Design a binder for this molecule. Structure first.
Ligand SMILES: *[C@@H]1O[C@H](CO)[C@@H](O)[C@H](O)[C@H]1NC(C)=O
Ligand SMILES: *[C@@H]1O[C@H](CO)[C@@H](O)[C@H](O)[C@H]1NC(C)=O
Ligand SMILES: *[C@@H]1O[C@H](CO)[C@@H](O)[C@H](O)[C@H]1NC(C)=O
Ligand SMILES: *[C@@H]1O[C@H](CO)[C@@H](O)[C@H](O)[C@H]1NC(C)=O
Ligand SMILES: *[C@@H]1O[C@H](CO)[C@@H](O)[C@H](O)[C@H]1NC(C)=O
Lengths: 52, 439, 439
């Protein structure tokens, strides 16, 4: 798993690698109400449920 | 003119600041951080290495009794055995068949190889810090180097810089550390003069050139076998060899915040904690008067594309009419949008192009070009790549940043409910007033 | 066998402690502290010394115009003057009577004498501690030397000693100090690159052997007088010289707690704060069984004189009956009285003499000699001298210490008044019951 702050991996005697996550989603921020909710849920799962 | 700014402790991300002085044109500076180093103060306690055992030849005395005296050498031992009858290759050694004795002795010294293979114990104290920067100044790159505290000042091309102090005192080293050929470990080594028979610290010395050695290994002499001449003994094996085979992972692979470790001298580099304030003093001859700079009178904005990825995913076109040929600065008036370009050249009646990056779903911002402002707006799409190899170049979002369509729906629901409360309350007020008056 | 004690941090006064182990005779030890040293950790910042000015020969060009170019040397200046007409011992210099010019220049360097007369600035950090002891052991004096923390142990005559850690962290040094030939001062020196024209720090360098020099003196050239050839100038005087004449008193004369100070290396000696714990390990071979020590069967105490002065002003005579010849230890069973002698010799039927010191006005204490107890009491007189040249060798007294005569008067007065309340109280109770029952 890749956390927000990033991951570092070392293999043998080689140099380490670095990875960072990037935003993606299957919803849309414009259009019908039920598609608006999905957009924010997939980015900030915990705050969306509390606020709603 | 004195200017003060604050920069976060992140390597590889450029930042910009605006300088504004009445009566003169505005100026924009760009800064980028390349390295930060911490270095503690160290003190030596003792060193350890392997040992050697010395056994001189036995003394065999037949038809008699022998004895031995005490000596001051480390781990000295003597013993006397009776009833021996040794043999050699040509026959028995001595004529007497009884009343013989044997004497044996041994002691412990320091190995010769300690000058090359050794480990050292240190005690650590407060560390210092240093930093190096790149600054874009009047169209040229210049470099500065200074200590990260307020007690140093440098001058490059008649500009004075002062950096520090840091906001945090976090360090990855504890009070006691151990160093061996490029590795640093955190370990609570035993006190001097209080060693153990089979662990780290059985042999101790103060310097590789010293003559005093402390030893706490076990040494017991045993009875020789029948018909043989030899000196058997029992002893605990060396503790330095054992440590090498089970020492575990080093500090480089376990430290937090992504710090790197080096040992000659001991250092820690590129720890991302805190932030660093910076102060700069700019001379008067570097400024240009408002009457000499060109003026721009008419503007419009259009945005053909936007994708809110971690890179520069935007493009913008601005139209302008200028009074004369010259140079101009570009600076953004909002915090959630960053613009790469620092300056442009303006002439006649034409257009200019810029690029930007942002995390907003719906983008609205202002752009300032030589003391005038223009309004831009557009809609943005999400990306498709899940993982990349470089950090983001924009800041995070707050609770107030919400798409315009989402805000519209909140307003209708909240307003509609509130009206029903408003109308119901008016009925109640009227009924009480009537009942009061009727009575 | 472990034993733990605590001694206060006072130099030149002996202390005693008692070791009691079942099955063996008691043993008494004596200890005295000779020196305590603190030493900080230092890092160097910069140095200062005098400066020198270099002026080459002037250039006189008649019927022409001169000009000069810029250089990078510190505090460089050049000027051009018009209308000159020099004279020499043989007559006028140049044929022209007009349009003459003169060129002048000067710059600043570092003096050669800086290798012998200079001052240095330092940063201070946490200090270490060390100590030296004298111990009376088995009838002989031995000495030990060790670091004042729990990380060091020494062995003298088969005994282990551990000293420390200390109970206070007070140090007389601040963060910034300046050192000059045996004197140490506390001073907030200006930062590197930020000197002043006439105070401490006009000239700065990183080490006595460096080639980089920073200077912030004022240097202005002036017009030459008519008919002469010379190069006049105006410059602020040296700031290092002024400091030597106005520096004031050093730390050795102003520091609190009576500390002494030495500078090679920088140390503080004999500051009286806190107390020091001590741990000692005694082998079994040093003890004697109770069956071999002599016994004492009858005791008495008589005291001919007592004056409660700062020195040993008491004398006592004790009678005894002993079973056989041998040694015995003596010890006090109260805190207000201290006894000088540690060991005595006993034989047959005889008497021994001892001396003591105390601050009590009325004395009562117990003395133990080889597992027996005796009771002594006396009245003491005050001294006649106002001032002495040494500290007291006894402890202070408390509120409960009062002479026997004074205590008796307090008891009689309080008892008498209490009776009056007690008698009056009983009459009230009797009357109250009669009223209750009769109604
Ligand atoms: C979105 O839909 C695609 C359809 O192929 C699916 O693979 C993916 O797991 C879904 N979720 C995200 C976050 O992409
Ligand atoms: C190289 O050898 C010298 C002595 O011969 C020793 O002091 C030093 O530690 C050695 N260095 C390495 C990397 O083994
Ligand atoms: C040097 O300045 C140029 C602009 O003239 C810039 O493009 C370049 O990135 C600078 N050098 C570095 C190492 O950033
Ligand atoms: C003695 O002179 C040398 C240089 O000749 C100097 O380094 C040293 O500090 C001087 N010592 C004293 C006590 O003056
Ligand atoms: C040394 O020991 C003797 C007893 O043998 C004692 O009288 C003397 O006071 C000791 N030394 C010092 C400096 O007290």
């Amino acid at each position: 798993t890749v956390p927000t702050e990033g991951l570092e991996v070392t293999w043998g005697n080689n140099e380490p690698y670095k990875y960072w996550p990037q935003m993606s989603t299957n919803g849309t921020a414009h259009g019908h109400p039920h598609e608006i909710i999905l957009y924010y849920y997939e980015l900030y799962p915990t705050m969306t449920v509390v606020i709603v | 003119y004195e200017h003060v700014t604050v920069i976060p402790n992140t390597v590889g991300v450029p930042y910009k600041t605006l300088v504004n002085r009445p009566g003169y044109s505005p100026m924009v500076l760009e800064m980028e951080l390349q390295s930060v180093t911490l270095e503690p103060t160290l003190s030596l306690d003792y060193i350890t290495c392997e040992y050697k055992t010395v056994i001189p030849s036995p003394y065999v005395k037949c038809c008699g009794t022998a004895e031995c005296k005490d000596k001051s050498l480390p781990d000295y031992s003597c013993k006397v055995f009776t009833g021996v009858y040794p043999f050699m290759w040509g026959g028995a050694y001595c004529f007497c068949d009884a009343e013989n004795t044997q004497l044996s002795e041994a002691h412990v010294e320091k190995s010769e190889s300690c000058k090359t293979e050794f480990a050292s114990a240190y005690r650590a104290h407060t560390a210092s810090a240093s930093a190096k920067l790149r600054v874009l100044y009047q169209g040229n790159n210049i470099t500065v180097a200074a200590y990260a505290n307020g007690d140093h000042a440098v001058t490059v091309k008649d500009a004075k810089f002062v950096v520090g102090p840091m906001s945090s005192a976090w360090t990855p080293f504890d009070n006691k550390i151990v160093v061996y050929k490029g590795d640093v470990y955190n370990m609570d080594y035993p006190p001097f003069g209080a060693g153990r028979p089979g662990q780290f610290g059985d042999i101790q010395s103060r310097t590789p050139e010293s003559k005093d050695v402390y030893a706490n290994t076990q040494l017991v002499l045993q009875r020789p076998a029948a018909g043989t001449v030899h000196v058997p003994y029992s002893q605990a094996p060396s503790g330095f060899k054992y440590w090498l085979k089970e020492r575990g992972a080093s500090l480089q692979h376990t430290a937090p915040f992504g710090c790197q470790i080096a040992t000659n001298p001991v250092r820690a580099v590129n720890c991302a904690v805190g932030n660093i304030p910076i102060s700069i003093d700019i001379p008067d001859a570097a400024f240009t008067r408002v009457v000499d700079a060109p003026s721009v009178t008419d503007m419009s904005c259009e945005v053909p594309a936007c994708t809110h990825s971690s890179d520069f995913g935007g493009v913008a076109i601005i139209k302008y009419t200028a009074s004369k040929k010259g140079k101009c600065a570009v600076h953004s008036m909002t915090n959630a949008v960053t613009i790469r370009e620092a300056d442009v050249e303006v002439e006649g009646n034409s257009q200019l192009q810029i690029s930007f990056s942002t995390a907003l779903a719906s983008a609205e911002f202002r752009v300032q070009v030589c003391s005038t402002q223009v309004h831009c707006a557009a809609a943005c799409h999400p990306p498709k790549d899940h993982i990349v190899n470089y950090p983001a170049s924009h800041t995070t979002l707050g609770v107030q940043d919400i798409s315009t369509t989402a805000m519209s729906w909140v307003q209708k629901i909240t307003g509609g409910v509130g009206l029903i409360v408003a109308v119901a309350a008016l009925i109640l007020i009227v009924v009480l007033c009537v009942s009061f008056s009727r009575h």
